[PDB]
């Protein structure tokens, strides 16, 4: 299927594709043509993916001198695994269309937790454990011990890869993580290191956003060689929050206690070294005096001489001084305060620790830790985090704040004080991506208005287009319920949120909807407290019994294992005749991780506008900074994030394969003129006055009709 | 299963079939229906489901895996039409023998 | 009767508890109360 795209005729595998795909491709092409970044939105995942790959591949085949490589990033590995299979399918078509093989290579990267084959780490399942052992297995001392040929458990796959795998680069093809592991097993080469090396001889690379946002991993993959390469985000609607979160760090009482235990372990190691030999380790002292990896970005990090910290004793003393000050500053009993400059100024005043040596805390730590021949970093991790935090806060804080909380999060009060170095802007943190790469494309679904993004992120969008699904039938049906059958407003106002009538209206609505919606249905709540309160209220009433009697019900919690089992049971219940109902919190990890498909979340219910507790210090610092620095109003951004998060959790009902789904919003707020404008265009245009202010009964009636209309073939 | 326990003893030349008028999308079951579905295929029992106001997963797989069809009532005319269509003898599948 | 039987058939705790603590010189409604109370 040759597509008459604006720039060139593009070969495509499927004989038929929808009109919006042509627009999306020819629109995205503008970013290539204009040699600049842009933003756009498209509901379908697979369609926009395959069309993106086709467009960029054809463009790359047409202009290989202009674009050397394509960098694609997506939400998670399970999605990446499907995308890379779609690329293979596209390449298989292209090879069949061309009739011959071409020098093209594409691969997906992943952490050593998944992308590993060594027998000793294979029984390990925690990422830090696998990484710590892998690092130890690949460590220079283990390599040296291996070169000594003494009895040693070593990574034969690494030695054979360094010897042979490095000597011969893989010629061409597409290698999925499972296929890359099998390849590594067959070749006897480390899949992770082989993939990392293959980046040097590959045209397409796939990894998640944190492989691009965290500078340690991102720098190794975003080298200057990619000075004229294109990077594309496919579902980074929360790129700001992920970026800020990747920059933010949390310190706690137990963290400091672990750091102290680690510090005592370092001291014991220094003693063991001093009693054995320190002169050999002083070989590092020369390069240090001459002048895991730090999270500091390319332009922020420098190989400057570490300063007064010139010995292990100095570093350990300097670390002791800081740890004591941090513990002291953390254990202080007072209201939550923000000291962005004052913490550093306080550190200089209270313990006379200057930012200059402190800037090299992580640099010296890794150097010292390496020379110390430590077993593994897994246990030292809290101390490394403290050292990373220390260098980070001492280097720059323009886009950060220090928050001190007498108690742990998620709890009203606990005798475990915590400190946060909360980040507040994505622009400066993501700046290297836009500065180095020639084009950046922000693609996503459930994407709230685009013009807010150029404010939160520093970019000059070449494209500003919002696409809507084009089909012979309205496969998606958004609807907003604003009134309960009890002739009462169903709005989730903060004071009205706890109203028994609204709670009852949601229960009656869910009872009826769960009875009429086939297979799997899902409902999102604002928070566990309201959810439990709501469930408890429904349990005191007959509502919860009638619901469970009509269909099985499952509820999500903070526990990943319990929610995973419950979700698997929910899905298995949907496979069988029993069917199931899934209740979850919109902000819950399950909502950002789960993908909804036909009969698996066929209908998604949103109870109220998802507004986070506005008294939370994190929100306060973030929101005031956006107003002070980026000039965005408090209610503007707070509503934008609520609209975005609602659409994100609710819009996931449509993912691909042209399967129908229902999206009901139980709040008249969504029907307001501003909220409607903040709603994504595809939802906004399918939404209409007939379904904009439906009564609970009207919602059930329109849903039942829509289900009847969707059951027949196209 | 009650139908299969009856239709299993039927001769091989006769087309064994079941017509399901499904009304309530929720249905309780004592065991995994997939085993029963595999047994229905092996038993060569043609199963076709008619869903009223419901587009159920189990009915979808049950019909299409067994070779039968799953349809849903659009309106009274659709219901009349679907039953009228089911009056036709089933077309012989390539797996069916005379 | 269906109340206790459905619970007994559905839950392992009641299944085991009713087998050992089977009603004797008592009313079955008391056993129901001991469960839901």
């Amino acid at each position: 299927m040759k597509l008459n795209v604006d720039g060139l005729l593009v070969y495509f595998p499927y004989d038929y594709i929808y009109p919006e795909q042509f627009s999306y491709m020819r629109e995205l092409k503008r970013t290539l043509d204009a040699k600049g970044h842009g933003v756009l939105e498209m509901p379908s995942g697979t369609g926009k993916t395959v069309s993106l790959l086709a467009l960029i591949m054809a463009y790359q085949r047409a202009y290989p001198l202009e674009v050397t490589k394509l960098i694609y990033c997506s939400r998670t590995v399970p999605e990446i695994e499907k995308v890379i299979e779609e690329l293979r399918k596209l390449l298989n078509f292209y090879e069949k269309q061309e009739g011959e093989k071409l020098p093209f290579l594409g691969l997906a990267l992943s952490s050593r937790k998944n992308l590993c084959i060594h027998p000793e780490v294979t029984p390990l399942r925690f990422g830090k454990d696998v990484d710590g052992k892998c690092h130890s297995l690949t460590a220079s001392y283990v390599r040296a011990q291996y070169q000594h040929d003494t009895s040693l458990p070593h990574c034969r796959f690494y030695e054979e890869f360094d010897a042979h795998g490095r000597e011969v680069p893989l010629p061409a093809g597409i290698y999925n993580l499972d296929d890359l592991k099998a390849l590594g097993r067959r070749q006897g080469w480390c899949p992770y290191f082989l993939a990392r090396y293959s980046i040097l001889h590959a045209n397409v690379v796939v990894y998640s956003y944190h492989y691009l946002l965290d500078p340690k991993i991102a720098d190794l993959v975003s080298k200057e060689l990619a000075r004229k390469a294109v990077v594309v985000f496919d579902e980074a609607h929360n790129i700001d929050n992920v970026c800020i979160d990747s920059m933010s760090v949390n310190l706690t009482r137990r963290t400091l206690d672990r750091c102290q235990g680690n510090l005592e372990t370092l001291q014991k190691t220094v003693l063991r070294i001093k009693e054995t030999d320190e002169q050999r380790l002083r070989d590092e002292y020369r390069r240090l005096v001459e002048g895991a990896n730090p999270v500091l970005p390319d332009e922020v990090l420098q190989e400057a001489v570490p300063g007064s910290i010139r010995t292990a004793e100095h570093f350990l003393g300097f670390l002791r001084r800081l740890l004591e000050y941090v513990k002291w500053r953390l254990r202080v009993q007072h209201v939550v305060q923000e000291s962005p400059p004052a913490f550093l100024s306080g550190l200089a005043q209270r313990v006379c620790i200057q930012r200059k040596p402190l800037r090299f805390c992580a640099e010296r730590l890794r150097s010292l830790l390496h020379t110390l021949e430590i077993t593994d970093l897994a246990d030292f991790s809290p101390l490394t985090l403290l050292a990373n935090f220390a260098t980070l806060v001492s280097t720059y804080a323009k886009g950060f704040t220090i928050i001190i909380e007498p108690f742990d999060d998620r709890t009203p009060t606990i005798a475990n004080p915590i400190l946060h170095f909360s980040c507040m802007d994505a622009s400066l943190a993501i700046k290297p991506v836009f500065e180095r790469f020639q084009s950046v494309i922000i693609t996503s679904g459930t994407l709230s208005p685009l013009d807010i993004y150029p404010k939160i992120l520093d970019f000059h969008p070449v494209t500003m287009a919002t696409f809507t699904m084009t089909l012979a039938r309205v496969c998606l049906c958004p609807m907003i319920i604003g009134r309960g059958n009890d002739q009462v407003a169903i709005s989730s106002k903060f004071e009205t949120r706890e109203d028994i009538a609204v709670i009852r209206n949601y229960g009656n609505l869910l009872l009826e909807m769960s009875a009429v919606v086939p297979d799997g249905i899902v409902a999102f709540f604002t928070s566990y407290q309201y959810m439990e309160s709501t469930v408890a209220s429904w349990y005191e009433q007959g509502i919860l019994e009638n619901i469970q009697r009509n269909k099985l019900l499952f509820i999500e919690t903070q526990d990943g294992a319990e929610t995973s089992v419950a979700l698997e049971k929910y899905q298995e219940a949907c496979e069988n005749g029993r069917g199931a109902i899934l209740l979850s919190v919109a902000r819950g990890k399950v909502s950002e991780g789960i993908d909804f498909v036909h009969h698996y979340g066929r209908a998604v219910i949103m109870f109220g506008v998802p507004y986070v507790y506005t008294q939370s210090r994190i929100l306060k610092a973030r929101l005031e900074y956006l107003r002070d620095q980026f000039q965005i109003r408090e209610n503007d951004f707070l509503t934008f994030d609520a609209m975005r998060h609602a659409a994100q959790c609710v819009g996931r009902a449509i993912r691909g394969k042209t399967d129908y789904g229902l999206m009901v919003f139980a709040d008249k707020r969504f029907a307001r003129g501003d909220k409607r404008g903040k709603l994504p265009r595809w939802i906004q245009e399918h939404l209409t006055d007939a379904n904009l202010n439906l009564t609970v009964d009207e919602g059930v009636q329109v849903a039942k009709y829509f289900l009847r209309q969707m059951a027949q073939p196209f | 299963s009650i139908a299969m326990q009856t239709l299993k003893h039927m001769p091989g030349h006769t087309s064994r079939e079941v017509l399901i008028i499904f009304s309530s999308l929720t249905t309780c079951d004592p065991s995994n229906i997939y085993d029963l579905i595999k047994t229905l295929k092996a038993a060569k029992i043609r199963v076709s489901v008619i869903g009223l106001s419901a587009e159920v997963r189990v009915c979808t797989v049950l019909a299409r895996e067994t070779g039968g069809t799953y349809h849903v009532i659009l309106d009274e005319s659709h219901y009349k039409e679907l039953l009228t269509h089911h009056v036709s003898p089933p077309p012989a599948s390539s797996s069916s023998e005379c | 009767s269906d109340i206790i039987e459905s619970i007994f058939r559905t839950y392992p705790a009641v299944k085991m508890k009713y087998a050992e603590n089977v009603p004797h010189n008592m009313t079955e409604k008391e056993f129901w109360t001991r469960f839901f109370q």
């Binding site: 469930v535 499952f554 | 004592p30 065991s31 | 058939r9 559905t10």
Partner: peptide, 22 residues
């Protein structure tokens, strides 16, 4: 309070497990 959710989800879990013969 959480026991209600735990029990209700245990119930649905046991109903599903009971509906799955070994």
């Amino acid at each position: 309070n959480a026991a209600i959710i735990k029990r209700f989800n245990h119930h649905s879990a046991m109903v599903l497990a009971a509906g799955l013969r070994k």
